[PDB]
Amino acid sequence: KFLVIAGPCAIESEELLLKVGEEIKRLSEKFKEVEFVFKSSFDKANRSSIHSFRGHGLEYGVKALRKVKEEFGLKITTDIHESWQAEPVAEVADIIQIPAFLCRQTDLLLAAAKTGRAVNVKKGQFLAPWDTKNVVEKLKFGGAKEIYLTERGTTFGYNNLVVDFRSLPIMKQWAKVIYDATHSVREFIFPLIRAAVAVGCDGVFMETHPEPEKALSDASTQLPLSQLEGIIEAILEIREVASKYYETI
Amino acid sequence: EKFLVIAGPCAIESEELLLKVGEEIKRLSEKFKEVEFVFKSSFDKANRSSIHSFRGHGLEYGVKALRKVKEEFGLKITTDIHESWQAEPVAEVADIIQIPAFLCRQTDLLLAAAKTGRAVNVKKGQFLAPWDTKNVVEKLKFGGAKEIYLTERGTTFGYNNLVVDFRSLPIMKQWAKVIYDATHSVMREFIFPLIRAAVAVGCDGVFMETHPEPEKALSDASTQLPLSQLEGIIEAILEIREVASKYYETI
Amino acid sequence: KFLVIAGPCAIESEELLLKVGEEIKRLSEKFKEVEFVFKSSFDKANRSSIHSFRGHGLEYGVKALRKVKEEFGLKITTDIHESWQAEPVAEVADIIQIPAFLCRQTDLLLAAAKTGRAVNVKKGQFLAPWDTKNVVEKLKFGGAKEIYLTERGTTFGYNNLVVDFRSLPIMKQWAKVIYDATHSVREFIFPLIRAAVAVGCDGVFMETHPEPEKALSDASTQLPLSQLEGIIEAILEIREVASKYYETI
Amino acid sequence: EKFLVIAGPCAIESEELLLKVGEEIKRLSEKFKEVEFVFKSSFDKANRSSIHSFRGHGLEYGVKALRKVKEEFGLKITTDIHESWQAEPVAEVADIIQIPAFLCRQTDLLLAAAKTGRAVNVKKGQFLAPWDTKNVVEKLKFGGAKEIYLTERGTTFGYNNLVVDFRSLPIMKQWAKVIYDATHSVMREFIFPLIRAAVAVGCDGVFMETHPEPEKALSDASTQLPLSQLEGIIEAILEIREVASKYYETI
Structure with a gap:
């Protein structure tokens, strides 16, 4: 079924996660045809500035994420940034998320695949669509079976990303495709999420x-x-209306 | 507002070819009555890469062939001009004068088109940013154009490649009606999906x-x-x- | 010999052209190894805004340009924007310049070639280096023998141009290459003109x-x-120092 | 200031290969005494595209092989790290710790490198703008780095293509020493010409x-x-x- 991965950017506090988990829990009961996954990062490991908020740590994050899965019965997902984090994170996360800048780090992909969980790789802003094939192959080699590739935009000049929707059908040849509606661009978020489902994808990320x-x-x-x-x-x-025209494979 | 569908053979290879396509377009206009069709075809491919490529049979032949289509099917006509002097003769048949992508900044060509009184459709250059079309429309209004269209046809993305930045649709929509070129923005395998994206985002018409x-x-x-x-x-x-229309944002 | 095409952007008045022509005349006598060409446009036909300065017309421009060639004995060059202008302009211009946006207009190239003068085509910001080959072929077909291709930057995202210096050696396979130091970027003008001569080109445009x-x-x-x-x-x-390493052809 | 030349085999295929290249580099260091040479080689290609490609023989083997070079030729050493924990062991031999292009924003990796006390050279990511390296250097200084280098290695330009925007050299020069990567920015036919461009513009060293x-x-x-x-x-x-040096602009 259609996937909808949503949640707050960072785990500002387990309190915030519960508030959002509640609303996501509600939509979950309202849209039975859609599979929801709660998302939030325990650490913003790649901020531009050293003086930016990163988070409350891995343990506090895994803790809070557990609270959401236990209090709401929602599937969970967060991202890892170094190999060692894969195991402790797999304890709670149903899907392990690989950051875009790290989509090429072999050990990170292998570590994620080893846990047995599903893996979702954000496509690097530097990567061509056809080059995601080798990304998937790495994960399969690592024992992973449920693999997702996420569209989040491509480098277009400086400080700007463009979404080449040609990537959805291309990447679909080797893995399920998710569209990141918030990192790919606020006024353009909805217009572009509409284009993504018109083209065809297996889920959206917000x-x-x-x-x-x-x-x-x-x-x-x-x-x-x-x-x-x-x-x-x-x-x-x-x-519902557009799916009729999605090209085969 | 009525959705626009501009379609036809790229080049006027012959008046016969034109009459064959026009026949079908006329049939579809009868079926899709909520659509406003416009028959398009160039009397000259003035910018081919190779000197050895097909260009056309002249303005004279082209305009006569287009006049035949309109005459025989009652279809609106649109064709592109390449130099200022062609606006007048072309306006005698074209309901919409098209400005080529590479020429979207040539002031005199735009002014020539605008004074004819006919509608003008400017193809956004592969070098132009969405927000820079504001001055394009301004030139047109300055020159007397009352009905203006901006067509999205892709943007330079590295060498020999064009990407479609759909954010351009709502940006350009701020000052003009927006058309999506489904065939030049892509190869044929992506025509359909990108055209689906164009209508979901929201535009006033498509060009094929x-x-x-x-x-x-x-x-x-x-x-x-x-x-x-x-x-x-x-x-x-x-x-x-239709299904996406209720979610189109107001400009 | 090395070419140095210089002059004011637009012909603001024949007075201005004489002032600049005098200085260019002086450098001309000082650098006998370099061939100088006076440049100026009689009309800015592609300004973004309708409310911008365009010029004093073709006749006034050709007039003033004549004054520079007669009062200083300097070769002349200006750009055309429509076929018909090629003939009246050839009267004075030693080199006919084709605007970047117009490097693909077949009739404009043919009209320039027909005059017998030399032709300098600014490479469109949308063109790949290898694609200039067909540009040259058009001009040769038109009877042109002295052909120049000018590097002026390539579209890099929005409102930004990047200079891919790989284009100089590539374009050199079929025509002499000139580097536009002022349209390719003020702080970066000199640094980049240095790179151009370090790589190898037949002249600079300023x-x-x-x-x-x-x-x-x-x-x-x-x-x-x-x-x-x-x-x-x-x-x-x-x-002088770098030429020793310029690759053959 | 002394020009820097960082060179060596991409991967540590064997300690023998390293000793063979080091021998030549040592010879050149004796000849070009106004140059400061640094022997480079990776103990691991942690980001290859294919899972079937060569990676290396482990950190242990690599560090021992590099230590051999320094020991046998008295050459400075530099190698790249991929995870935080590798900084400490690598710093035991490397005079300059290199941060991979794709990892230039990973805060912990940069901080790990900086606290070792060794110099740090960050390869500018293909996704990063020149002016955004200011915060990269800031992280390094924050973490205790006293000797910092930024290396230009090209920028994403469409798919499967990198362009070198030489304006980046003077921009980055505002906050750090600038190195030009002659081999990854391009194919071999353009290595020489672009390296000529780098030194004419002005940089503090080259990487080959x-x-x-x-x-x-x-x-x-x-x-x-x-x-x-x-x-x-x-x-x-x-x-x-040398001939271009008198024209290098002041930052």
Whole structure:
């Protein structure tokens, strides 16, 4: 079924995760045809500035994420940044997320595959679509069977990313495809998520937060919690009509 | 507002070819009555890469052939001009004058088109940013143009490659009606999916080159859409447009 | 010999052209090993805004340009924008310049070739280096024998141009190569002109003006007249040393 | 200031290969005494595209082989790390710790390198803008790094292509010493010309992968420079640098 991975950018506090987990739990009961996965990072390991918020650590993060899975019965996903983190994170995470800049680190992919969990690799802004084939092959070699490739934009000049939707059908030849609606661009988020489902993908990825203008990360992009339902309904309707034309394989 | 579908053979290879495509377009116009069709074809491919490539049979022949289509099917006409002097003669038949991508900044060509009183459709250059089309429209209004279209046809992305930045659709929509060129922005395997993306995002129309037998065409044999496939593609985009339409954001 | 095409962006007045022609005349007598060509446009036919300065017309321009060639004995060059202009312009211009956006207009290239003069085609920001081969072939077919291709940057994201110096040796396979130092980028003008001669080119193209901050065009890029000599001396010295390593053909 | 030349085989295929290249580099260091040479080679290619490609013989073997070079030729050493834990062991031999292009933003890796006290050279990611390296250097200084280098290795330009925007050299020079990677920025036919451009613009050093027989290398067989060609290339850039040096602008 269609996948909808959502949640706040960083684990600002397990309190915040519960508030968002509750709303995601509700949509979950409302859209039985969609599979929801709660997402949040225990650490922003690649911020541009050294003076930026990173998080409360791996343990506190895994802890809070457990609280969401236990209190709401939602599948979980977070990202790892170094091999060793794969095992402790697999304890709670149903899907292990590989950061875009790290989509080429062989040991990181192998470590994620070894846990037995599903793996979702954000496509590097530097990677060509056809070059994701070798990414998948690495993970398969590592024992991974449930593999996702996520579209998040490509380097277009300086400080700018463009979404080449030709990548969805191309990457689909070797793995399920997810579209990152918030990192690929706030005014262009919805327009582009509509294009993604019109083209065809196996799921969408959205960072959401109660009050984005106060979130300690991606405050200019995180989708306002209240708007999630309406966007999910919108893409399910477009998908229903457009799926009729999705090209085979 | 009525969705626009601009389609036809890339080049006016012959008045016969034109009459064959026009016949189908006329049939589809009768079927898809909520669509406003415009028959398109160039009397000259003035910018081919090789000096040895097909160009056309002259402005005279082309305009006469287009006049035949309009006359025989009552279809609106559009064709592109390359130099200022061609605006006047072309305006005698074309309902919409098209400005080529590479020429979107040539002030005199735009002004020549605008004074004819006919509608003008400017293809966004592969070198231009979305927000820089504002001045393009301004030149047109300055020159008397009342009906203006901007067509998205891809952007330079490295060498020999064009990417479509769909954020351009809502940006350009701020100052003009927006058309999506499904055939030049891509190879044929991506025409359909990207056209689906265009209508989901939201545009005022699509532009498609179509030919009875693309493999024999004198230009764009690799990208022209087989005429038999036109109907289905049109039905699909109308379907996707409708279901996505309630979510189109206000400019 | 090495070519140095210089002059003010637009023909603001024949007075301005004489002032610049005088200085170019002087450098001309000082650098006998270099061939100088006076450049200036009679019309800025492709400005972004309709409310921008375009010029004083073709006749007034051809007139003034004649005054420079007669009063200083300098070769002349200006650009055309439509076929018909080729003949009247050839009267004075030793080299006919084709605008970058127009490097693909077959009739414009043929019209320029027909006059018998030399032709210099600015490489479109949208063109790949290897694709200039067909540009040259068009001109040869048109009867042109002295052909130049000019590097002026390539589209790099939005509102930005990058200079891929790999184009110089590539384009050199079929035509002499000129480097446009002022349109390819003011702080980066000199650094890049140095790279161009280090790599190898047949000449440089520079827009210069007495008081750039008052020029009715490219006021943020035009090189200050007073600085021309020092830059010419600099590139001749680098060339002298670097030419030893220029690859054959 | 002394020009830097960082060169060596891409991968530590064997301690023998290393000793063979080191011998030549030592010879050139004796000749070009105004140059500061640094022997480079990776103990692991942790980011190859294919799982079936050569990676290395382990950190243990690599560090021991590099220690051999320094020991036998008195040459400075540099190698790249991939995870935080490798900084400590690697710092026991490397005079300069290299940060891979794809990892230039991984805060912990940079901090790990900086605390060792060794110099750090960060390869500018193909996704990074020149001006965004300011924060890279800031992280390093924050972490205790006193000697910092930024290496230009090309920028993403469409798919499967990298362009070198030489304006980056003076921009990055504002906050750190700048090195030009002649071999990864390009294929071999453009190595020489672009390296000439780098020194004319102005940089503090060059980085070149070199191998006795590139066609047999276990990595970058297409771009590694034949060892026999190293001397001439170095002489040329020193010549071009000198004549262009008086025109280098002040930061």
